[PDB]
Design a protein around this ligand. Sequence first.
Ligand SMILES: [Zn+2]
Length: 118
Amino acid sequence: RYQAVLANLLLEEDNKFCADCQSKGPRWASWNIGVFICIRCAGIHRNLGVHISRVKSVNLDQWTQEQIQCMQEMGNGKANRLYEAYLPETFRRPQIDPAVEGFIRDKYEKKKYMDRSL
Ligand SMILES: [Zn+2]
């Protein structure tokens, strides 16, 4: 029902890369946060708990209109501005599982780098 809408959102340039690790062509999402993520980072989001992140597959899960709306109102661009506001420009974005797990908890659970005014 909503694959088309999701497809059009996956065309947005920021959404062509995982929000957390920037690997190309993410096919998963945290819909309450509003980010498109790769399957590995979706695995990490899942373990954060549903109080923090609620993870769906873009192509295997059924979506509600409100959940789609969540992605429309955020996405990886707007999410970077909120959750990575205070990320040093020097920062080396991690790539390996345990470093990525720390970075994702830091971003969404601890909110180390978040601009709270947003
Ligand atoms: Zn990722």
